[PDB]
Design a protein around this ligand. Sequence first.
Ligand SMILES: *[C@@H]1O[C@H](CO)[C@@H](O[C@@H]2O[C@H](CO)[C@@H](O[C@@H]3O[C@H](CO[C@H]4O[C@H](CO[C@H]5O[C@H](CO)[C@@H](O)[C@H](O)[C@@H]5O[C@H]5O[C@H](CO)[C@@H](O)[C@H](O)[C@@H]5O)[C@@H](O)[C@H](O[C@H]5O[C@H](CO)[C@@H](O)[C@H](O)[C@@H]5O)[C@@H]4O)[C@@H](O)[C@H](O[C@H]4O[C@H](CO)[C@@H](O)[C@H](O)[C@@H]4O)[C@@H]3O)[C@H](O)[C@H]2NC(C)=O)[C@H](O)[C@H]1NC(C)=O
Ligand SMILES: *[C@@H]1O[C@H](CO)[C@@H](O[C@@H]2O[C@H](CO)[C@@H](O[C@@H]3O[C@H](CO[C@H]4O[C@H](CO)[C@@H](O)[C@H](O)[C@@H]4O)[C@@H](O)[C@H](O[C@H]4O[C@H](CO)[C@@H](O)[C@H](O)[C@@H]4O)[C@@H]3O)[C@H](O)[C@H]2NC(C)=O)[C@H](O)[C@H]1NC(C)=O
Ligand code: HEM
Ligand code: HEM
Ligand SMILES: *[C@@H]1O[C@H](CO)[C@@H](O[C@@H]2O[C@H](CO)[C@@H](O[C@@H]3O[C@H](CO)[C@@H](O)[C@H](O)[C@@H]3O)[C@H](O)[C@H]2NC(C)=O)[C@H](O)[C@H]1NC(C)=O
Ligand SMILES: *[C@@H]1O[C@H](CO)[C@@H](O[C@@H]2O[C@H](CO)[C@@H](O[C@@H]3O[C@H](CO)[C@@H](O)[C@H](O)[C@@H]3O)[C@H](O)[C@H]2NC(C)=O)[C@H](O)[C@H]1NC(C)=O
Ligand SMILES: *[C@@H]1O[C@H](CO)[C@@H](O[C@@H]2O[C@H](CO)[C@@H](O)[C@H](O)[C@H]2NC(C)=O)[C@H](O)[C@H]1NC(C)=O
Ligand SMILES: *[C@@H]1O[C@H](CO)[C@@H](O[C@@H]2O[C@H](CO)[C@@H](O)[C@H](O)[C@H]2NC(C)=O)[C@H](O)[C@H]1NC(C)=O
Ligand SMILES: *[C@@H]1O[C@H](CO)[C@@H](O[C@@H]2O[C@H](CO)[C@@H](O)[C@H](O)[C@H]2NC(C)=O)[C@H](O)[C@H]1NC(C)=O
Ligand SMILES: *[C@@H]1O[C@H](CO)[C@@H](O[C@@H]2O[C@H](CO)[C@@H](O)[C@H](O)[C@H]2NC(C)=O)[C@H](O)[C@H]1NC(C)=O
Ligand SMILES: CC(=O)N[C@@H]1[C@@H](O)[C@H](O)[C@@H](CO)O[C@H]1O
Ligand SMILES: *[C@@H]1O[C@H](CO)[C@@H](O)[C@H](O)[C@H]1NC(C)=O
Ligand SMILES: *[C@@H]1O[C@H](CO)[C@@H](O)[C@H](O)[C@H]1NC(C)=O
Ligand SMILES: *[C@@H]1O[C@H](CO)[C@@H](O)[C@H](O)[C@H]1NC(C)=O
Ligand SMILES: *[C@@H]1O[C@H](CO)[C@@H](O)[C@H](O)[C@H]1NC(C)=O
Ligand SMILES: OC[C@H]1O[C@@H](O)[C@@H](O)[C@@H](O)[C@@H]1O
Ligand SMILES: OC[C@H]1O[C@@H](O)[C@@H](O)[C@@H](O)[C@@H]1O
Ligand SMILES: [Cl-]
Ligand SMILES: [Cl-]
Ligand SMILES: [Cl-]
Ligand SMILES: [Cl-]
Ligand SMILES: [Mg+2]
Ligand SMILES: [Mg+2]
Lengths: 324, 324
Amino acid sequence: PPGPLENSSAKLVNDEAHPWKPLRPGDIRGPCPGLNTLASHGYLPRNGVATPVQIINAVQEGLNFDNQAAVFATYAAHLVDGNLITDLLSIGRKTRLTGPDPPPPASVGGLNEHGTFEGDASMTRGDAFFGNNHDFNETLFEQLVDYSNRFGGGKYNLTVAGELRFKRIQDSIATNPNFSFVDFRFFTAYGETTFPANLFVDGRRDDGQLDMDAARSFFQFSRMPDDFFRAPSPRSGTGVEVVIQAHPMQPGRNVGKINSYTVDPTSSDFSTPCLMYEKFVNITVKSLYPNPTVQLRKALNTNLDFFFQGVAAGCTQVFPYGRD
Amino acid sequence: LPPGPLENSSAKLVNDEAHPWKPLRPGDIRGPCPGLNTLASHGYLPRNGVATPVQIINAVQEGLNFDNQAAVFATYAAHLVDGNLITDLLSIGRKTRLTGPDPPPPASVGGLNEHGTFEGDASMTRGDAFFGNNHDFNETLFEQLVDYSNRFGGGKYNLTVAGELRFKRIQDSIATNPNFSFVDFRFFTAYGETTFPANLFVDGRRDDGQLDMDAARSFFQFSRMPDDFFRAPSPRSGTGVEVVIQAHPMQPGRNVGKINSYTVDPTSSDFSTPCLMYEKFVNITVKSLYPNPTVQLRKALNTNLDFFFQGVAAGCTQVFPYGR
Ligand SMILES: *[C@@H]1O[C@H](CO)[C@@H](O[C@@H]2O[C@H](CO)[C@@H](O[C@@H]3O[C@H](CO[C@H]4O[C@H](CO[C@H]5O[C@H](CO)[C@@H](O)[C@H](O)[C@@H]5O[C@H]5O[C@H](CO)[C@@H](O)[C@H](O)[C@@H]5O)[C@@H](O)[C@H](O[C@H]5O[C@H](CO)[C@@H](O)[C@H](O)[C@@H]5O)[C@@H]4O)[C@@H](O)[C@H](O[C@H]4O[C@H](CO)[C@@H](O)[C@H](O)[C@@H]4O)[C@@H]3O)[C@H](O)[C@H]2NC(C)=O)[C@H](O)[C@H]1NC(C)=O
Ligand SMILES: *[C@@H]1O[C@H](CO)[C@@H](O[C@@H]2O[C@H](CO)[C@@H](O[C@@H]3O[C@H](CO[C@H]4O[C@H](CO)[C@@H](O)[C@H](O)[C@@H]4O)[C@@H](O)[C@H](O[C@H]4O[C@H](CO)[C@@H](O)[C@H](O)[C@@H]4O)[C@@H]3O)[C@H](O)[C@H]2NC(C)=O)[C@H](O)[C@H]1NC(C)=O
Ligand code: HEM
Ligand code: HEM
Ligand SMILES: *[C@@H]1O[C@H](CO)[C@@H](O[C@@H]2O[C@H](CO)[C@@H](O[C@@H]3O[C@H](CO)[C@@H](O)[C@H](O)[C@@H]3O)[C@H](O)[C@H]2NC(C)=O)[C@H](O)[C@H]1NC(C)=O
Ligand SMILES: *[C@@H]1O[C@H](CO)[C@@H](O[C@@H]2O[C@H](CO)[C@@H](O[C@@H]3O[C@H](CO)[C@@H](O)[C@H](O)[C@@H]3O)[C@H](O)[C@H]2NC(C)=O)[C@H](O)[C@H]1NC(C)=O
Ligand SMILES: *[C@@H]1O[C@H](CO)[C@@H](O[C@@H]2O[C@H](CO)[C@@H](O)[C@H](O)[C@H]2NC(C)=O)[C@H](O)[C@H]1NC(C)=O
Ligand SMILES: *[C@@H]1O[C@H](CO)[C@@H](O[C@@H]2O[C@H](CO)[C@@H](O)[C@H](O)[C@H]2NC(C)=O)[C@H](O)[C@H]1NC(C)=O
Ligand SMILES: *[C@@H]1O[C@H](CO)[C@@H](O[C@@H]2O[C@H](CO)[C@@H](O)[C@H](O)[C@H]2NC(C)=O)[C@H](O)[C@H]1NC(C)=O
Ligand SMILES: *[C@@H]1O[C@H](CO)[C@@H](O[C@@H]2O[C@H](CO)[C@@H](O)[C@H](O)[C@H]2NC(C)=O)[C@H](O)[C@H]1NC(C)=O
Ligand SMILES: CC(=O)N[C@@H]1[C@@H](O)[C@H](O)[C@@H](CO)O[C@H]1O
Ligand SMILES: *[C@@H]1O[C@H](CO)[C@@H](O)[C@H](O)[C@H]1NC(C)=O
Ligand SMILES: *[C@@H]1O[C@H](CO)[C@@H](O)[C@H](O)[C@H]1NC(C)=O
Ligand SMILES: *[C@@H]1O[C@H](CO)[C@@H](O)[C@H](O)[C@H]1NC(C)=O
Ligand SMILES: *[C@@H]1O[C@H](CO)[C@@H](O)[C@H](O)[C@H]1NC(C)=O
Ligand SMILES: OC[C@H]1O[C@@H](O)[C@@H](O)[C@@H](O)[C@@H]1O
Ligand SMILES: OC[C@H]1O[C@@H](O)[C@@H](O)[C@@H](O)[C@@H]1O
Ligand SMILES: [Cl-]
Ligand SMILES: [Cl-]
Ligand SMILES: [Cl-]
Ligand SMILES: [Cl-]
Ligand SMILES: [Mg+2]
Ligand SMILES: [Mg+2]
């Protein structure tokens, strides 16, 4: 697992060695505009299948994503969505490129796999319930623009993030009878809304105000603006507290029908990051791998260790298969 | 310019042969900040505790891996209100002739000890200014930190301990300090500070956010790094502050001339309005110290207000109290 950038100042990353290209048939793109754009500028394999080490070097070098967040997000995703023997992860749909599957109920389903990492009330993608959880959706993007106009002076910023995050949750509650918003997804849904203001903003300026042309380029086409400079120093979810505090929300879920959102008092929330860590490892990962062979157990323990090092709140390490 | 981010920001020995702890030698100034005190006491900063903004940022980054945005934000904020803008020198403690000849009233140039500019109420290990001394280590407060760590962190200080102690300290001040104030700048900074010991005082080889009480006392009381201390393995500052905020959500306010009269102030900024915090700091705090400044002082203010703006986490739009 790579350490932080050696030299992490702003610099042009839309450069000569990293041109955008269109998708070839077979090139895999998914629900993350950050990984998508990196793949499309060749910071990641252009076909969208990568090792964890590759994804981490790419997000730091391409966009100056900080090391702790890159390590948390990448090994969390690899544990639930990736192939632990081959050490590969698809950034979108399940693919044979990741090699021979483990036994069920592990899915190795790529970032597109619903319920594991990816989840509901995304900004520019529709819920899995309605059929397609990974393609750019134009109606939701035009909503992001609207809110930018109304709260951001035409630009996306943390204030807009706060408003739209809530709007999307409300939208899901009213329309999605499967709406779920607990645990891992509750956590990551709020930190994602800060990323575009933090990281899609040209680094020479770095003033957290994202223009709509830049926003469309990343979200829709996986493409950096012309002459794009990365952020002037490493960061990820700075300001998430702005987005949480705008519209206080307790973790919960619709119960088999629309508008039935019911708080779940067993879910972690922001005051309990280590319950969220423990349930991810001790319930989510453990249920995908309830009885691993010696070889799989050893791959699981190595990735669980690397995952534990990226956990922002620190926490106490949990061992689903033992320390041995 | 402010220094940019650290070249190679990995974990490494920082309590080394070139940076030993030394006892205070009269002349030497120590203040309310255990981070800055300890850096001065190991020679990362000047040992007498008076430094330029550039020295302080280089010191917090190289000594402790404090991240660049936070180092710039705090350093220029404190310099604007507590420092000498003409000599370019800031005391980490008391007001001193070592920062040079003063500007005109009503500027104070009072050092970091100056109550209510940067320093303020409900500190963890230091008493409120109202009771007499806002900067000395207070053994009864540290013992209550040790007690909350036994109760909530298994004997170690971590973000769960921080959430409970931060709220305890606020309740102590409401009950005992008739002047307690907890608005605007202080309301914002108080929360982030409670994360720093978990993120930054924990040996960088471990980096699991569990701070032992011997390490904690070393930094807070003696201004000394633990033996063989490694700084954190990448840059960070207020990671996990939302964990502290959401443990006991609370709005900004003040006692109203007597104990137990905490009154929410609806004109204060809070965590959802970080740009109003920025703006009030500049329009009100800074500009009432320097209501009408001469030509050279006006240049120095505008230069430092620029650097300050670049450090604002939320991004925001720049305000210009003296024009552009
Ligand atoms: C190092 O720092 C420490 C701490 O800052 C310094 O010591 C402090 O010094 C100040 C200044 O002298 C003292 O201020 C004075 O406080 C007294 C009140 O004392 C008693 O009540 C205190 C508050 O308790 C309530 O709130 C807390 C916090 O939530 C809570 O835990 C308590 O249980 C109680 O809560 C109430 O409300 C709750 C709802 O939230 C309810 O559940 C509950 O039912 C309660 O009703 C308390 O902390 C204090 O406890 C200490 O002292 C006793 C022994 O006396 C000891 O047994 C405890 O273990 C503690 O050690 C007391 O119980 C107040 O009366 C004074 O008010 C006078 O003066 C002010 C200011 O001038 C005037 O405005 C008033 O009108 C009045 O004349 C005063 O404000 C502070 O109490 C003290 N704290 C300590 C010692 O812990 C120390 O000085 C510093 N050292 C150095 C060297 O500087
Ligand atoms: C992102 O970009 C925006 C614009 O550049 C920045 O500026 C903030 O913009 C916000 C959002 O529009 C402003 O907040 C709004 O201000 C309105 C007026 O505020 C004053 O006047 C009213 C009287 O009408 C007073 O009551 C109030 O106390 C203020 O003195 C308010 O009417 C708005 O409140 C209401 O809005 C919604 C609309 O959907 C209502 O439904 C609610 O009831 C709500 O109460 C709103 O607060 C804000 O003033 C701007 N801030 C500043 C400092 O200028 C953001 O700063 C920028 N963000 C970042 C992180 O960069
Ligand atoms: C570090 C490896 C990363 C992984 C494994 C990862 C994975 C994901 C996944 C699976 C989603 C979908 C969540 C949802 O359902 O909405 C997502 C969303 C998101 N990602 Fe990433 N991501 C990573 C890095 C990045 C980077 C570097 C950026 C920005 C620089 C970023 C920006 C975002 C944003 C803005 C979304 C939300 C998009 C939306 O809601 O429309 N990600 N990420
Ligand atoms: C970068 C320049 C910095 C400045 C200008 C600065 C200034 C301050 C000031 C004025 C206070 C007192 C606030 C109060 O409690 O009343 C404070 C508190 C504190 N600082 Fe800093 N600080 C800096 C860097 C850091 C660093 C690098 C660390 C640790 C790595 C740190 C750790 C803390 C902690 C833990 C407190 C609270 C102490 C307490 O509540 O007992 N600071 N700082
Ligand atoms: C709304 O949520 C429900 C409940 O999660 C979704 O139904 C579930 O769909 C999954 C995935 O297709 C099913 O699990 C699979 O079942 C097949 C064959 O039945 C099995 O061979 C697979 O290995 C896997 O078990 C499952 O039947 C079902 N879960 C239930 C009923 O608890 C439902 O599809 C969602 N609705 C929409 C429109 O998305
Ligand atoms: C992009 O996202 C938008 C908004 O989230 C999706 O639009 C939604 O589409 C449904 C139908 O697919 C619209 O309502 C439908 O109305 C009929 C009545 O004839 C009803 O029988 C259906 O059950 C359904 O309710 C819905 O109003 C619309 N929501 C909007 C516009 O806010 C859209 O499907 C997404 N695009 C893609 C390609 O998925
Ligand atoms: C606590 O605040 C009080 C009230 O603001 C202060 O004392 C008063 O305020 C001014 C100072 O600005 C004094 O000149 C008045 O005589 C005081 N009395 C009243 C009724 O206003 C005082 O500055 C603070 N006390 C301490 C110890 O810091
Ligand atoms: C702070 O340390 C404590 C103990 O090491 C951790 O708290 C425990 O959390 C477990 C599950 O992780 C719960 O059963 C208890 O509520 C906790 N034990 C207690 C309170 O004695 C806590 O997670 C740590 N916090 C962080 C952020 O690392
Ligand atoms: C511009 O600022 C200067 C001070 O830098 C002002 O000087 C005033 O001097 C009087 C003398 O009694 C003081 O009492 C005031 O406090 C000072 N004013 C201020 C605002 O601090 C001078 O008056 C100001 N000139 C203009 C045109 O505003
Ligand atoms: C702080 O001061 C600035 C101006 O120095 C404030 O006023 C706004 O400034 C912008 C930028 O030039 C103008 O577009 C607006 O027209 C200004 N408003 C007014 C009423 O003139 C800003 O609002 C101030 N903020 C606070 C909280 O005091
Ligand atoms: C506008 C503002 O910031 N006012 C605070 C106030 O709420 C508090 O009562 C006062 C005296 O202790 O200190 C001021 O700094
Ligand atoms: C670090 O990165 C930037 C952009 O390449 C450059 O300005 C700076 O000198 C580099 N520092 C080095 C290579 O030491
Ligand atoms: C996970 O397992 C660990 C150790 O066996 C245990 O401490 C913890 O309670 C478990 N977590 C849950 C939520 O069951
Ligand atoms: C291991 O036990 C779990 C119980 O959760 C079961 O699902 C899994 O199939 C078991 N595996 C064996 C050894 O095949
Ligand atoms: C840079 O960090 C690496 C990572 O551990 C380390 O090996 C090396 O000693 C550092 N380089 C310098 C010049 O300090
Ligand atoms: O143990 C070293 C390697 O182990 C694998 O399991 C991976 O997931 C890598 O990221 C790691 O570098
Ligand atoms: O530009 C005015 C001020 O700028 C600062 O950065 C310092 O270097 C000072 O020496 C000077 O007073
Ligand atoms: Cl980093
Ligand atoms: Cl530099
Ligand atoms: Cl940094
Ligand atoms: Cl005492
Ligand atoms: Mg989604
Ligand atoms: Mg204080």
